[PDB]
Structure formats: structure tokens, C-alpha cells
Amino acid sequence: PNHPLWYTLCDRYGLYVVDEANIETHGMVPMNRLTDDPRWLPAMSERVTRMVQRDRNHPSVIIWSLGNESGHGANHDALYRWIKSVDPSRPVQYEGGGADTTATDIICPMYARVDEDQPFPAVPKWSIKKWLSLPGETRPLILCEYAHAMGNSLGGFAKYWQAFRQYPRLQGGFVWDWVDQSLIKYDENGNPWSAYGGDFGDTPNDRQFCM
Amino acid sequence: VVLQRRDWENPGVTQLNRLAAHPPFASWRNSEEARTDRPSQQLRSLNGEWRFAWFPAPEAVPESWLECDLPEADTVVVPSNWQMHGYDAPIYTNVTYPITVNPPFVPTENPTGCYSLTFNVDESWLQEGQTRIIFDGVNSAFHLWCNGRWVGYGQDSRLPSEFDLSAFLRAGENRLAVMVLRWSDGSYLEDQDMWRMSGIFRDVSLLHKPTTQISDFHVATRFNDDFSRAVLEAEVQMCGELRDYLRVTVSLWQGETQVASGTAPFGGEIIDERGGYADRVTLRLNVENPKLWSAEIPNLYRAVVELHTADGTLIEAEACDVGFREVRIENGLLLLNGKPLLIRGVNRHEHHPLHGQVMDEQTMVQDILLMKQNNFNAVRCSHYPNHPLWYTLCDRYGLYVVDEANIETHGMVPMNRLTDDPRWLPAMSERVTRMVQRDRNHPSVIIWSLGNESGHGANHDALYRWIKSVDPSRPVQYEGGGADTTATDIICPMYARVDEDQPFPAVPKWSIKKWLSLPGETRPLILCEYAHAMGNSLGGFAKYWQAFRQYPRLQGGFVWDWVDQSLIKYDENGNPWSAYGGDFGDTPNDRQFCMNGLVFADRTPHPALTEAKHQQQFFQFRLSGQTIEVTSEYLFRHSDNELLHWMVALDGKPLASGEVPLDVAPQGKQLIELPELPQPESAGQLWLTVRVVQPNATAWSEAGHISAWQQWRLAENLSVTLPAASHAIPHLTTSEMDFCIELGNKRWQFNRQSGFLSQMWIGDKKQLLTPLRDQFTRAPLDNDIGVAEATRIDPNAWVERWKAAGHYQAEAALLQCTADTLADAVLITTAHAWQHQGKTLFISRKTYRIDGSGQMAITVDVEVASDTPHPARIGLNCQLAQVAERVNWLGLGPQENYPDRLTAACFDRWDLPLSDMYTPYVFPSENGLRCGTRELNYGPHQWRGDFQFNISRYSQQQLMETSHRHLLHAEEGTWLNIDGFHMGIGGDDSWSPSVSAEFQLSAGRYHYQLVWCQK
Amino acid sequence: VVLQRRDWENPGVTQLNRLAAHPPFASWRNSEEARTDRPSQQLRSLNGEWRFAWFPAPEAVPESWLECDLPEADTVVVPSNWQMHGYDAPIYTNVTYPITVNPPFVPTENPTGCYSLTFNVDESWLQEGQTRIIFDGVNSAFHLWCNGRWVGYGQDSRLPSEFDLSAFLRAGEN
Ligand SMILES: O=C1O[C@H](CO)[C@H](O)[C@H](O)[C@H]1O
Ligand SMILES: [Mg+2]
Ligand SMILES: [Mg+2]
Ligand SMILES: [Mg+2]
Ligand SMILES: [Mg+2]
Ligand code: NA
Ligand code: NA
Ligand code: NA
Ligand code: NA
Ligand code: NA
Ligand code: NA
Secondary structure, three states, X not given: OOOOHHHHHHHHHOOOXXXXXXXXXXXXXXOOOOOOOHHHHHXXXXXXXXXXXXXXXXXXXXXXXXXXXXXXXHHHHHHHHHHHHHOOOOOEEOOOOOOOOOOOOOEOOEOOOOOOOEOOOOOOEOOHHHHHOOOOOOOOEEEEEEOOOOOOOOOOHHHHHHHHHHOOOEEEEEEOOOOOOOXXXXXOOOOEEEEOOOOOOOOOOOHHHHO | OHHHHOHHHOXXXXXXXXXXXXXXOOOEOOHHHHHHOOOXXXXXXXXXXXXXXXXXXXXXXXXXXXXXXXXXXXXXXXXXXXXXXXXXXXXXXXXXXXXXXXXXXXXOOOOEEEEEEEEEEOHHHHHOOEEEEEEOOEEOEEEEXXXXXXXXXXXXXXXXXXXXXXXXXXXXXXXXXXXXXXXXXXXXXXXXXXXXXXXXXOOEEEEEEOOOEEEEEEEEEEEOOOOOEEEEEXXXXXXOOOOOOEEEEEEEEEOOEEEEEEEEEOOOOOOEOOEOOOOEEEEEEEEEOOOEEOOOOEOOEEEEEEEEEOOOOEEEEEEEEEOEOOEEEEOOEEEEOOEEOOEEEEEOOOOEOOOEOOOOHHHHHHHHHHHXXXXXXXXXXXXXXXXXXXXXXXXXXXXXXXXXXOOEOOOOOOOOOOOOOHHHHHHHHHHHHHHHHHHOOOOOEXXXXXXXXXXXXXXXXXXXXXXXXXXXXXXXXXXOOOOOOOOOOOEOOEOOOOOOOEOOOOOOEOOHHHHHOOOOOOXXXXXXXXXXXXXXXXXXXXXXXXXXXXXXXXXXXEEOOOEOOOEEEEOOOOOEEEEOOXXXXXXXXXXXXXXXXXXXXXXXXXXXXXXXXXXXOOEEEEEEOOEEEEEEOOOOOOOOOOXXXXXXXXXXXXXXXXXXXXXXXXXXXEXXXXXXXXXXXXXXXXXXEEEEEEOOOOOOOOOOEEEEEEEEEEEEEOOOOOOOOOOOOOEEEEOOOEEEEXXXXXXXXXEOOOOEEEEEEXXXXXXXXXXXXXXXXXXXXXXXXXXXXXXXXXXXXXXHHHHHHOOOOOEEEEEEEEEEEOOOEEEEEEEEEEEEOOEEEEEEEEEEEEEOOOOEEEEEEEEEOOOOOOOOEEEEEEEEOOOOOEEEEEXXXXXOOEOOEOOOOEEEEEEEEHHHHOOOOOOOOOOOOEEEEEEEEEXXXXXXXXXXXXEEOOOHHHHHHOOOHHHOOOOOOEEEEEEEEEOOOOOOOOOOOOOOHHHOOOXXXXXXXXXXXXX | OHHHHOHHHOOOOOEEOOOOOOOOOOOOOOHHHHHOOOOOOOOOOOOEEEXXXXXXXXXXXXXXXXXOOOOOOEEEEEOOOOOOOOOXXXXXXXXXXXXXXOOOOOOOOOOEEEEEOOOOOOHHHHOOOOOEEEEOOOOOEEXXXXXXXXXXXXXXXXXXXXXXXXXXXXXXXX
């Protein structure tokens, strides 16, 4: 959840908002180790419930999200259902555990390609055009993340938009991401420079992947 | 720290340092011992003699108790509820919380139970591995100290709390200190309609496990379409150091025969982008033609889970019983192994009249046997997870179980105040999740329940979904918020009636037949509670069963309930008596509303049990001519322990009998042709009685067990022959005060002031202590009283309406009293009016005809004002001077039966001791009635007609004036109530009018006739 | 008690004495100001200069700090991240946790920021009603004291934690 003013500004300027719970357990092995554990259901619940209690009157918020990169656990299903019961006015999405689980109203993959399948075991990223028409699938598809804008990037961005326009159920996506997470440091002369991972003696680190 | 944090007034803290929940463990170190389910040396019972001190609050607990035994402490047996040892009072309240409703706070005065044990721990237990303590049941919260050092905290009175003691214990003597709080924030989730007690009331144990251990295992069975093939899937989780040489073997056993086995190293399949569970393994075993588990045939296998090294050294083994069965809902029907269930259920609390809420195997087995013997196949754990042994017994004996979370918030306003609150989601979640974690491997558990009477909140929906995700093998039900919410797979109302709607705002109780077909509704309907068996009850039970059999999607229900929650107290002479709410000085309380059982607290049956047994029979009968058609309602078993016996009797006199083997497939039919019947020249009604008898003993029944019965009327021969012509004629004498009639040594006296038969003589012995008078009232049944809370009086209740109309105070006014002499008899004609405040309620017109054979023919015609509430009965009563040993009748029996509860009763000649004609309901009321009676014999007296009767040492007046059965005193002689007509007893619930219209005495004009003579 | 319970190494304790969550409040006492979304006198910002001291672990925090300003403390702007003031290093890691994966435990060396502020309250607030404090964002957990008395505890770095200060406030400087 963002600084409260963000939602006010989005209400007044006009932007659609996906409001997302502060739950990411990416470093766990496997990713759902905590989210499938009932001992962690109380801690997770508060991150979801208190967001909804805070932000439910904002028109700019059109979709709730259960968090990010926390696999798919039973706690996700429980909290999906909580939100659906408390606030029928907004769909609930969540990408974890393969982007199309029982914890999401929207097929919401990250970096699924337009035509090319990525058949990873357990959590495949199908071509977005293929994904829609998988046996029994009826849901809209909106990428929670796509077109990774790291440095000299956005190659093939036009491919997504052509597909988005041609396929009714391909309803767009969210670019990753808006702003370089660089920090300012100063050299011997006091002149500013842009710093990334590792530049503060921080180790282990992931270098420029923050930008 | 403990006192400062007040963890018992914080629903955010339900535990501190508590270990994860899991299925029952024993840490066997020998594979064979796991296979055979023999006691494990690694699982130590700490049950027995503990030290105990009571305190008014945790603030009153002395510090020295943490390190040293208190001299003022006593030595008591554990497990126990401290109320049962007399330390304070057990409280009976239904809805209203026993504490002020101020969540999450509890009273400053909070009864505290200080438990301690000094005990030895062996050397070997601390050299290696993990030693944990397990508290199966502590009511309602507790802190734990080991050797003076604080260990942890626990809540939820009905699930085990476990703590690691490895770093706390020492070789030699150790001391545990357990501070048990009666009230906690947990109490807000424990508002069940039952005795409010506290203490360490379930087992305490030590369990030693290796550091490298089996920490969890789940067993699933899936099938093909015709159940001829199965896969057993066993997920195994470990704790400790993962090593490449580690292996798990899961073996499956049918007795001594290994049917399947699989071995694998640790490492599950990839589940997401980060990989899989390195600390888990899933074994899949193929099983051909598995023996399937049901309540009908509880086939069990044994699964053994071995943690071992590659080279073959056993580290440890865990094990469970496995029942191969599938539970699913399909096309609106609850299916078991592909077949639609008919739930013959009962709700059962954990209650013992001496030990309170402490359970034992003997009581558990007694209950199961009595249940199965009375045609029950299912139990609901009202309203909490049970003692772990209960599930083992239900697995092995064969009962379908609804396992229910320990969540009830009935006293909240509104009911969902806590359950719709996300602050209470954590505490609720633990009560659901930890139950599923514990009980998921039991085949007997077929349905999960989210609790009871907590309204419908978003927390229910969240937890409904959690269970569906974690365990797809079992439907989830929950009744709160109108019985058909989004948090339930089954329409599961409580006390919804068969035909009658009860359209309460927001939470209506529709007719069950109507409920199924509401626009858009597709789910099965099984009542979580029905036919409230409080005192003289179960009227209309047959109506439910007729509906269940007719409607595919009406799949039965659970009766409320199994056993009266009465407690033993002792009088001045040390004699035990049955007590209820308020008898312990507990106030406020809800009196007798804790006694709703089909059986008494000591497991003696109430009469209603036989009605249940009859209606729940597994064989159905039809008669056409001389053909009996037997239909089996079993889904799986053939009738391979069943013989059908038949008998034809003429007014109780045996004329022909026989026996035929039953060979009926499940759901099949068998036709039995009756042989040529002799034609009785004597007058009277021929009756056919059939019974299904089990010739062979079983685990649950004796040889000769009767499981089903039915009766039909056959040919009747009406009497057209004249009675032997008399020549003696009775002699009438008229005085100012009396009409006197004499014949031989017999005298009849009619009081001319009252217009009643005031006395009869046989020789010099008077026959009456009170005159023969009309009676239109009964000592109110619990159903007539119609209260569920002691504070709430319902003006609509039958007793309130009868009282307000003046029924109990109505005075007989003489309208007519005349005497006439006939050619062979004397005729007395009488008329009376019963009035209240100038309103004529009833008019009774009678003739008494006394003929030369000494028979007194009584003809009664009654008018009942159409605007007065319908009377409880229309009959006569008198106090006979005689006490006699036996009561002999030709009518429905042998047990107590009422108009809306007489299907179990059979027409025959019955002979019982007098005391059996009284039913000792703990709260006294009208009782012991027998209907459809044509002849009654008692001492020198015989009554003939078509009537209902009761006979006993207790007057209706004494019964209505006495609150407890032990306070009843036998009156002089014998009170006889003989009714032409008696109102139904009802019982669809016990807190509103529940007698169906067809059983109300509403006709306005009634006719009955009796003959009184000397035998 | 605070150091003994280790609430920051227990997922069963995510808060102590925290008020219920709710939509944005301002408690306007004038309907027209509520309509036009004008500043409310009942909603006060405590943003600005606070006193701050950095410690390597919570065990290193002196008891004296509960009632007395540490002579070694600096004046800093709040809101802020203390890495941006240079007290310790910000860490950029993608997937791998910045701490050893050992739930629910965290490193013994756990950087601790000790913030304080002395402030006065309108006399009318001391007379009636309920004064609460609102922390819109504290990363990642915190205990709170008011006038040397423990108030409560909160977790989740991205939602407001709110506590009732009514029974803690005094006349003059708090
Ligand atoms: O509604 C109910 O009926 C019963 C009445 O005795 C008892 O209170 C049960 O616990 C409750 O579920
Ligand atoms: Mg608590
Ligand atoms: Mg209740
Ligand atoms: Mg019958
Ligand atoms: Mg914590
Ligand atoms: Na589109
Ligand atoms: Na990145
Ligand atoms: Na049915
Ligand atoms: Na009851
Ligand atoms: Na047979
Ligand atoms: Na009575």
C-alpha cells in the first residue's frame, strides 16, 4: 500500500489503481513456504485486511492484489475469499503460483511473451494469446508486469500493443517499471552521481538490477 | 512478565512457544509396534496424581509455587475439571455469557487452577532427541513453567497444546507448574450451550522424538469410477538435518499382509519458481480391489510411515488406520463411495455425570454401542474437536463423523459480531486449522464444520475456503447466518420443520421440503440439529423420516441430542440425585435446558430412543395380501446377519409364527409369501408383527439383536354375539346426598352435590381415595413450557395459554345429575360445566350404565369452546385405593407412547411392573402414557374401550409442583388417568409451540366410552 | 518485558494495543470544512525535527532513553530513512533475503533507530475526547513509549499504526 496521498491524487487526476498487500516472500524455498503455512495466516491476513479497511472508499482503486511473488499457498485462497466477501465491488488478482490460480479473478502473468511459450515446470508462462484459450479458461488477461525497461530496453513493445488491440480478452498490462531505483552519492569534489547495488558497501547485492 | 502482559485478555495472543499441530504421533522405534498399534515407550502418560490449589485470580498466586510445592495444595486426579472436585461451581447457561460481555476482557475475579507435578525423566530422553509435553485439553487458558522457568502459553480448550521441554528438563526429578485460567479471551469463542467448567480435563503426556523426525504426514485415497482401483497418497514432512542417505518408506497392511510398499529419498516435485520442498516426500501406492470403509462395514488398513537410512537403520515410525472411502457432493447429493447417504445422526457432547467433561474409553464405547444398536450411523461433534480416542473408535466401529471447530459466539449481539471482525480472524483460524491438522487422516471424519451459532462473518468465508484448499476430500458445512450461506456445502439448518415454514427475518427456517427447491438452490439438506429430545419429546419424529425417504436431497440429520447434561449431587443421606442448572448456586442459569438427551446421564434410555431406532430402521416393509416385501436401505452390505421372524396374534393371543432367512442385496427387495393362515372363529382383530433379528453377535451387538420391526392389521371379526343374559338387576337407592347402586357385594356411590362417582365398594373395601372426575390438563412437558432461556417467557407457549385461559384452575359446576332404572340396569346421567371468570371452557355430558353383570358403561361427550386454547387431554382421573404389583394391558407398548410418538410401539398384550409405567424424567411432567389401548388390568379392576392411559403413584398435581424427580414422593394408592384423547407432545423444538395441527385437540366435540368392571 | 518477549521474532504478535484500521479521518468539527477538504484543527502533523540515535541492537539501547534525551542523539528530519542520513548502509538485494533465512528469527545485530520528540498538546485535548498518534509508515517494526510509559507495538512497514495516547498525555511538555 502507498502513501495515502497517492490515492487522493489518483482519484482527482484519474488513474486506475491496483492496490497491493505488503506481502512478498520471494526468497523462500519453495516460494510458498510461509504462504501455505497456517502459522503465517494471521500475519498475512492483517496485511490484506487492514489495506482494504484503509483504501476501500477510493474510486481510483479498481482491483485488489494479494501481494507479489509469494508462491501460491492456502493462505492466499483464504484471503482471496475474505476480500470477495467483504468487498464485492472490485476484482481480486494475484500472480503467484502460475498467474492463473484459484486466488485470482484475472490471469495476471509477469513477462509472459506475446507469441512465445515459456514452458517452465509447475509455473509455465504461456504466450498470452495461447493462455486465454487453454481448455476451460474464461478469464481476462492483464499482465501484472511486462516489457522490462532495464537500461536500453522495450524492444518488442509494439508486439504487445498489437496483440492487446486484436484480442478482446487481452486487456493490457503494467510495464516494469516507472523509475530507476538509483541513489545519489557524492565524489571527492562533492559532485552527485547515480549509485546502484553494492555502492554502499552492501553485500551480497544485485548491482544494477534495481534500475 | 506473565502478569504484566495479560495474554488471556488479548485475542492476538492465543499461544506463546507452542509447537505446530499434527496427526497423532507415538514415535515408535520399532516398525512392527507401529503396524500393530501397540503402546510406545516414547509416549509417556503423565496422568494420575497431581498437586492442585485454587485461587480467586492469577494475582493471588504466590511466586514460591513456581519453584516449590504449596503445602496448602491438595493431591488430586488428573485429568479432571476442578468443579467436579468441589473447588468452585459449574455454571449452566445457554446463550448468555457466564462473564460480562466486554471483549477481550474477563472478570478481575478469575478462578485460577494451580497444577503441579514432580516427576522423573530418564537419562536416555535427554542424551539425544526432543522431549515435548502434550496437553490434550486445558480449559480455557494456561501458562506453563518447567523447573521454575517459563515455557509457554496456550488457548483453545479442545485441542492439544504442545511445548518443547528439551532445554528445560533435567536428569532425575523435575517439576511442572501449570496455571490454568477459567476465563480468557478464548471464552468469547466458547459459548456452547453446556456446563461451564475448567481445568486440565484431557490427557497429559511426554513424547520423545529424534531430532531428525517425521513432523507431519497426510494420507489420501483416490479411486476410479467403480472403486475397483485405488491410489494411496502419503505426503511426509520431516524436521532436523536433511541428509542424502535419508529415506521414507510407506507400507500398507491388511492385517499381517503387506498389500503395498514404496520407498523414496526426500525431495518433492517442483511447485514454483523457487523449486520444491526439500524436506518433503510423497509416496504413491497402487491398491487393487480395496476393501472399502463405511459405517456399514468399517474396513481398515494400516499405514506405517518409516523414517530410515538407505542402509536400513530405522530412525522412527509413525502410523495410522486407513479407511478407503470417497466423500463427494455430486448433482446435489452427498455421496459415500458413489452412493447417496442417509444420515441417521445424533449430536453428542462430551459429558459424564460424575466426571463432567472428562472422557474415558468405557463411556465412549458404551455410547457407540448404544448408538449403533439404535440404528444411528453418524455423530456430530457438538461443538468442538473431541478427545483423540473418539475418532479412533468411530474409525473401527463405523460411524460417520462431523468434526466441528471450537468456535461458538452465541451470546454476542448480533451473533456475528466477532466472526465478521478481522481482529478475531487469527483466533478463529487456529481453532479451524489446528483441528484439520490433527484429524485429517481419520476415515470416520467425513465432513468439516466451522463451528456453531456464531452468525455468518467474513472470517467464516475465509476459513471455509482454507479447508477446501487444504483438504478437497471432505465437504465443509456451517449453519450460522441462515443455514445456506456461502460458507457451507450442505444446507444444514437447525430445527427447520418438515412442512411448516418459520419465516424469521434475515434467518428464516423454511420447511425442509420447500428449502431444497428455492430458486437457484441445488445443495443437499442435512439438519445439523433436529427433533429436540428434551424430556417427554420426539413427537413428530416419523414425519422427518417419511420426508427423508421421499426426497433424494433430504439426506437426514442429527438429533439433538444424545445424553442429558445432568450432574450428580448428594443429599443429607449421601444418596445421589440428578442436578441441572442452578443446583450448584450458579446464577444466572438456564435450569433444565441442559437436559435434551435421548438417554439419561448414566446412559439409561429415555422412551424416545425406541422411536428413533424404529424410524431409523435399515429395512422397509410392505404388505399386499400374503406377500411381505422387504426393502434394504443399506448401500454396501448384503443382509448376511439377518433373519425375519413373523407372528400373527388375535388380540394378543398367538395363532401362528415363523422365520425366514433374509437374502437382500443393498437397495434390493425380497418377497416373502406367508403360508396359509388358520381362520379364527373367535371375534377380534388379527395383527401381523414382523421383526428382523441378527442371529450372530457383532463388535457392536449381541446375538438375537432386533434391528427392525413393523405391524399390520389383518382380518377383523366384529363380535355379533349377545352377552350371557343376566337375571340379576342392580338396585338403586336415592337419598338427598347420594345415588347408591348395589349388586351382590358391589356398591357404587354418586355424590349428588358434585355429580361424580365418589366411591365404590367391593365387599367392605373402598376402591377410591379421590372421586372419578374429568381432567383436561396435564403436568406440563418441557415442550409445553417452551423456554430455552430461564428469563424468556413466551405467551404463545402452550402452558402460558392454558394458564391464562384458566385451564388449571377451572371449577366443575353441576348442570344435571339424574338417576333412572332400566329393565336390567341403573342409568345415571350427569352434566358439568368448567368455567373461569364466567367463561365456559368445557362441558362434559355423561351416562353411567350399571347392568346385572356388574359392568359400569361410561359414555362421555365433551364440548370444548372453540376460542379456548386446545386442551392437553380429554379424559377422567381418580386415585385408586389399591397398589398392585403388575399393570397388564392390550394396546400399544411396552414403552411410553404418545399420539405423535407411537410408531415404535406395537399392539399386543403387555405386562409390566407398576414402576415401569412411570418414566423418571429428571424434570417431572406428564409421563408414561400408553395409547391405542382396548383393555387395561390393575388388581381387581379392568377398563375396556379405546383409550390412552397412565398409571402411577404420582398425581398430575405433584408432577407439576415438583422440579426434580428425586423430590417426588409416592402418594397413597394409585393415580389413574384414562384419556379418550391426548394432545401430541411435539418437540420440533422446545422453545416455541411445536405440536402439529393434526395432533391438537381442535374438533370442538369429542366422544369416548369406557367399561369399568371387576376381574 | 519488552526485551524479554522479543515480539519482533514472533509472527503471532504483529501488534500490541494498536487501534482498528479505518479510512482517512480528520475529525472535522465543522461540516463545511469537511465538504471542502480544508485542514482540520483536530489533525496535527508531527513531521519535522526529531531527536535520533542509532544502535547496533535493541539490547544496546540505554534504559535512560525512555525518559531522557541521549546526549549523543542528533536532530533529524522526520519522515526519513536513516540510511539516507548515513547512519547505516542501504542494501540492494533482489530475491535473496538480506538476513539469514531462519523464520521467525532475525539477526542479533539488528540496527535500531531511537526516535524521540517533546511536544505540547492543546489544553482542550487534555480535557475531553481521544488523542491518538498515527504512524503512517515505520520500517519494519517499533515499540512506542509516551512520557516513559510503554504504549504499544506495531509491524507492517506500509500501513498506518495507530495508538491511543489519551491516558498518557500530560499538561506541558510530553
Ligand atoms: O441451537 C441449539 O439447540 C440446542 C438446544 O438445546 C443447543 O443449544 C445447541 O448447542 C444449539 O446449537
Ligand atoms: Mg489471549
Ligand atoms: Mg448456542
Ligand atoms: Mg407402524
Ligand atoms: Mg512479531
Ligand atoms: Na484487448
Ligand atoms: Na529489479
Ligand atoms: Na433422501
Ligand atoms: Na440445551
Ligand atoms: Na441372512
Ligand atoms: Na414438574
